[PDB]
Design an enzyme around this catalytic site. Structure first.
Site, PDB file in Angstrom:
ATOM      1  N   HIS A  45       0.804  -1.225   0.000  1.00 54.98           N
ATOM      2  CA  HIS A  45       0.000   0.000   0.000  1.00 54.98           C
ATOM      3  C   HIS A  45       0.831   1.266   0.000  1.00 54.98           C
ATOM      4  CE1 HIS A  45      -3.502   2.259   2.208  1.00 54.98           C
ATOM      5  NE2 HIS A  45      -3.655   2.333   0.899  1.00 54.98           N
ATOM      6  N   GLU A  59      19.233   6.604   8.392  1.00 55.46           N
ATOM      7  CA  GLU A  59      18.511   7.790   8.801  1.00 55.46           C
ATOM      8  C   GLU A  59      18.064   7.715  10.251  1.00 55.46           C
ATOM      9  OE1 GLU A  59      18.069  10.678   8.822  1.00 55.46           O
ATOM     10  OE2 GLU A  59      17.000  11.245   7.045  1.00 55.46           O
ATOM     11  N   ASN A  61      17.104  11.263  12.058  1.00 51.17           N
ATOM     12  CA  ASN A  61      16.289  12.477  12.177  1.00 51.17           C
ATOM     13  C   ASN A  61      15.896  12.939  10.784  1.00 51.17           C
ATOM     14  OD1 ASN A  61      15.407  15.244  12.435  1.00 51.17           O
ATOM     15  ND2 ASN A  61      16.349  15.325  14.444  1.00 51.17           N
ATOM     16  N   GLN A  64      17.078  16.735  10.057  1.00 49.11           N
ATOM     17  CA  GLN A  64      18.435  17.176  10.301  1.00 49.11           C
ATOM     18  C   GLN A  64      19.460  16.248   9.667  1.00 49.11           C
ATOM     19  OE1 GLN A  64      18.732  17.533  14.806  1.00 49.11           O
ATOM     20  NE2 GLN A  64      19.104  19.682  14.254  1.00 49.11           N
ATOM     21  N   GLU A  69      23.510   9.092   6.686  1.00 51.26           N
ATOM     22  CA  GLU A  69      22.551   8.695   5.682  1.00 51.26           C
ATOM     23  C   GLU A  69      23.162   8.335   4.326  1.00 51.26           C
ATOM     24  OE1 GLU A  69      22.734  11.674   7.214  1.00 51.26           O
ATOM     25  OE2 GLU A  69      20.821  12.516   7.786  1.00 51.26           O
ATOM     26  N   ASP A  93      -0.187  -7.489   1.730  1.00 48.32           N
ATOM     27  CA  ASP A  93       0.336  -6.133   1.778  1.00 48.32           C
ATOM     28  C   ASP A  93       1.851  -6.162   1.963  1.00 48.32           C
ATOM     29  OD1 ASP A  93       0.540  -3.385   1.708  1.00 48.32           O
ATOM     30  OD2 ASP A  93      -0.357  -3.121   3.738  1.00 48.32           O
ATOM     31  N   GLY A 186       2.262   6.570   8.313  1.00 43.98           N
ATOM     32  CA  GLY A 186       3.680   6.847   8.075  1.00 43.98           C
ATOM     33  C   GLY A 186       4.594   5.767   8.635  1.00 43.98           C
ATOM     34  N   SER A 188       3.635   2.601   8.282  1.00 47.47           N
ATOM     35  CA  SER A 188       3.377   1.510   7.338  1.00 47.47           C
ATOM     36  C   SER A 188       4.616   1.141   6.514  1.00 47.47           C
ATOM     37  CB  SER A 188       2.367   1.855   6.229  1.00 47.47           C
ATOM     38  OG  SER A 188       1.092   1.768   7.003  1.00 47.47           O
ATOM     39  N   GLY A 189       4.735  -0.182   6.303  1.00 46.58           N
ATOM     40  CA  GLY A 189       5.871  -0.664   5.504  1.00 46.58           C
ATOM     41  C   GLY A 189       7.080  -1.034   6.348  1.00 46.58           C
TER      42      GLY A 189
HETATM   43  C1  LIG Z   1       0.348   2.757   7.795  1.00 42.72           C
HETATM   44  O1  LIG Z   1       1.039   3.753   7.939  1.00 42.72           O
HETATM   45  C2  LIG Z   1      -1.071   2.576   8.253  1.00 42.72           C
HETATM   46  C3  LIG Z   1      -1.062   2.808   9.748  1.00 42.72           C
HETATM   47  C4  LIG Z   1      -0.036   1.920  10.430  1.00 42.72           C
HETATM   48  C5  LIG Z   1      -1.969   3.470   7.508  1.00 42.72           C
HETATM   49  C6  LIG Z   1      -1.870   3.457   6.014  1.00 42.72           C
HETATM   50  N1  LIG Z   1      -0.564   3.649   5.404  1.00 42.72           N
HETATM   51  S1  LIG Z   1      -0.092   5.187   5.077  1.00 42.72           S
HETATM   52  O2  LIG Z   1      -0.857   6.126   5.802  1.00 42.72           O
HETATM   53  O3  LIG Z   1       1.334   5.289   5.257  1.00 42.72           O
HETATM   54  C7  LIG Z   1      -0.269   5.219   3.327  1.00 42.72           C
HETATM   55  C8  LIG Z   1       0.895   5.248   2.582  1.00 42.72           C
HETATM   56  C9  LIG Z   1       0.832   5.250   1.194  1.00 42.72           C
HETATM   57  C10 LIG Z   1      -0.408   5.213   0.572  1.00 42.72           C
HETATM   58  N2  LIG Z   1      -0.478   5.209  -0.928  1.00 42.72           N
HETATM   59  O4  LIG Z   1       0.634   5.229  -1.501  1.00 42.72           O
HETATM   60  O5  LIG Z   1      -1.624   5.181  -1.382  1.00 42.72           O
HETATM   61  C11 LIG Z   1      -1.545   5.173   1.339  1.00 42.72           C
HETATM   62  C12 LIG Z   1      -1.505   5.169   2.725  1.00 42.72           C
HETATM   63  C13 LIG Z   1      -3.398   3.221   7.904  1.00 42.72           C
HETATM   64  O6  LIG Z   1      -3.793   2.059   8.132  1.00 42.72           O
HETATM   65  O7  LIG Z   1      -4.140   4.234   7.970  1.00 42.72           O
HETATM   66 CA   LIG Z   2      18.736  12.869   8.801  1.00 39.93          CA
END
Ligand SMILES: *C(=O)[C@@H](CC)[C@@H](CNS(=O)(=O)c1ccc([N+](=O)[O-])cc1)C(=O)O
Ligand SMILES: [Ca+2]
Length: 240
Positions: A45, A59, A61, A64, A69, A93, A186, A188-189
């Site tokens: 996602h 990475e 910070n 900064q 990095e 996912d 943020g 996620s992944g």
């Molecule tokens: C991940 O961060 C989860 C919460 C742990 C959320 C969804 N991911 S996101 O908000 O990072 C995201 C990234 C990229 C896309 N995109 O490229 O479409 C969409 C969402 C969550 O479950 O809300």
């Molecule tokens: Ca940095």
């Protein structure tokens, strides 16, 4: 990460920042795990939008210069073939990113150790989520890498009606749900690191939280279970 603490700079050397080009600059969007010197494991996602992406290793910070990095472009994106952006609850996912250049390993840049295929953690196993995701529901990204202790919640409990019901599958790991600590947008992944036989291994790829909010009691953060995809991961790296 909500309810996190700042990670020490060398605690989680496989954590990466996946960023997209935003005009003159770059913006963090997701975490990832460095699994080969030229491969990153992240959530499918995170790469649903047709953006220009880069990976930052070493990475700490985001706002900064850390003096550690390495910045590398993404040359190829391989999403699991069963992923569907309209059904995150279906699973799959996960995605692998081939880096344009191989990164150099050091105390801030290391490969994430992956569990053996099929490994399932016992309920309440010790894990830490790491990331620069929001520090509060509807909040802002962290500046410094955060970590939070999120004990696992096994499948029988996690897929129970008061937790996530049918939305959680056995190809996922649940962790947390205390109402205080959690992953958030943020994160996620990125990795879910769990201590097994004295070694931390990346057992999860952060996938989702409740639409109600990040830190919601009985809505543990949900991760793709890495140990369900070892063959897939090896097949992609060998074919690419
Ligand atoms: C991940 O961060 C989860 C919460 C742990 C959320 C969804 N991911 S996101 O908000 O990072 C995201 C990234 C990229 C896309 N995109 O490229 O479409 C969409 C969402 C969550 O479950 O809300
Ligand atoms: Ca940095």
């Amino acid at each position: 990460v909500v309810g996190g603490t700042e990670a020490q700079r060398n605690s989680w050397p496989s954590q990466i920042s996946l960023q997209y080009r935003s005009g003159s600059s770059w913006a963090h969007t997701c975490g990832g795990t460095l699994i080969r010197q030229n491969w990153v494991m992240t959530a499918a996602h995170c790469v649903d939008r047709e953006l220009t992406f880069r990976v930052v290793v070493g990475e700490h910070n985001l706002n900064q210069n850390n003096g550690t990095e390495q910045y590398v472009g993404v040359q190829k994106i391989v999403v699991h073939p069963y992923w569907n952006t309209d059904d995150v609850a279906a699973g799959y996912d996960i995605a692998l990113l081939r880096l344009a250049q191989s990164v150099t390993l050091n105390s801030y840049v290391q490969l994430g150790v992956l569990p053996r295929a099929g490994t399932i953690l016992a309920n309440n196993s010790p894990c830490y989520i790491t990331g620069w995701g929001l520090t509060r529901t509807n909040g802002q990204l962290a500046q410094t890498l955060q970590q939070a202790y999120l004990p696992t919640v096994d499948y029988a409990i996690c897929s129970s009606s008061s937790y996530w019901g049918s939305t959680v599958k056995n190809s996922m790991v649940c962790a947390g749900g205390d109402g205080v600590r959690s992953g958030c947008q943020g994160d996620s992944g990125g990795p879910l690191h769990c201590l097994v036989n004295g070694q931390y291994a990346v057992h999860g790829v952060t996938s989702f939280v409740s639409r109600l909010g990040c830190n919601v009691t009985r809505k543990p953060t949900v991760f793709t279970r890495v140990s369900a995809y070892i063959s897939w991961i090896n097949n992609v790296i060998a074919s690419n």
